[PDB]
Design a protein around this ligand. Structure first.
Ligand SMILES: [Cl-]
Ligand SMILES: [Cl-]
Ligand SMILES: [Cl-]
Ligand SMILES: [Cl-]
Length: 318
């Protein structure tokens, strides 16, 4: 009954773009911030009638935030550490949403602070989000926090850290990571499943979800199980190899290296849970109730992975 307007930031990011596409298709008007209008996705998103893009930085730009929230009733916020000041930006956005007065439900995409649950270090790009989560909880605005599982499409044969599905000379594939071969990890098809799940949270409403933490993951798989889904999907031998240090074969930003080293220690060295919150110990229950049509790792490897690889210029799929 009159779809409410949704405000979003980082519009071209996976989580935001997924929500935007489905929300607009069902009638929601969307107000989305993007750092720049250029780009395959930004251009794709601005061509959707129900969507309006507002280009500019979030860093020290509250005015843009006030503009974004004007006339909005719902918000889905996901920040990045890129411009630095992620905590600051997250608080400014929450304050801007409160000030707009019209936001009835504010969803923030949070991550754990591992050092709170054991003799473990805080993963640099995750812990900050939890801080923002604590802040948002204090605002007199209904809020819900989603914890995203590992994206299925992090996988690529390009020489990128942690999630390379390396193509060997013999046509076989190998995934090398510090993750214990058998401890199940939480996965997520961002493209297809983030959008529908977030929309159901909005449909259910703030009385049901105010204050809740939801694990946005629809299936748990150990690395060994992931490789077998790929092997089964591509009819190729795909095997997992546990490695102490992440193989970093290309140059990466300083902050990303620190993130990876934290990962070597937390999952490699300590074998700590991905979601170390007591609430998340099935961890997939709520997510599946929210969106029944979620896709698994085998469908990704077989139906999307080949196309994404060809799009990146790879030829193994001929
Ligand atoms: Cl609505
Ligand atoms: Cl438009
Ligand atoms: Cl509150
Ligand atoms: Cl490089």
């Amino acid at each position: 009954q009159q779809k409410k307007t949704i405000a979003v930031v980082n519009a071209t990011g996976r989580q935001a773009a997924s929500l935007i596409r489905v929300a607009a298709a069902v009638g929601h008007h969307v107000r989305a911030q993007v750092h720049s209008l250029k780009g395959l996705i930004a251009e794709e998103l601005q061509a959707i009638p129900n969507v309006t893009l507002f280009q500019g930085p979030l860093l020290n730009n509250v005015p843009l935030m006030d503009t974004l929230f004007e006339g909005a009733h719902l918000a889905f916020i996901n920040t990045t550490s890129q411009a630095g000041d992620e905590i600051a930006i997250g608080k400014d956005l929450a304050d801007a949403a409160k000030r707009a007065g019209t936001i009835q439900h504010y969803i923030y995409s949070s991550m754990p602070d591992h050092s709170l649950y054991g003799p473990w270090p805080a993963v640099p790009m995750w812990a900050p989000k939890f801080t923002v989560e604590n802040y948002v909880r204090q605002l007199g605005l209904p809020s819900t926090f989603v914890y995203a599982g590992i994206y299925n499409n992090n996988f690529t044969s390009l020489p990128y850290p942690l999630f390379q599905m390396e193509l060997m000379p013999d046509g076989t594939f190998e995934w090398h990571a510090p993750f214990d071969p058998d401890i199940p990890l939480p996965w997520l098809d961002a493209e297809h499943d983030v959008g529908p799940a977030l929309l159901q949270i909005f449909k259910d409403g703030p009385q049901k979800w105010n204050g809740h933490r939801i694990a946005l993951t629809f299936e748990t798989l150990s690395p060994v199980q992931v490789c077998a889904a790929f092997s089964r999907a591509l009819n190729r031998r795909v095997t997992y190899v546990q490695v102490p240090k992440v193989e970093i074969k290309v140059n990466i930003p300083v902050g990303y290296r620190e993130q990876l080293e934290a990962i070597e220690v937390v999952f490699g060295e300590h074998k700590a849970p991905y979601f170390p919150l007591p609430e998340f110990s099935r961890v997939t229950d709520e997510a599946r109730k929210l969106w029944s049509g979620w896709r698994d790792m085998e469908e990704y490897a077989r139906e999307v992975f080949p196309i994404e690889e060809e799009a990146n210029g790879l030829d193994w799929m001929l």
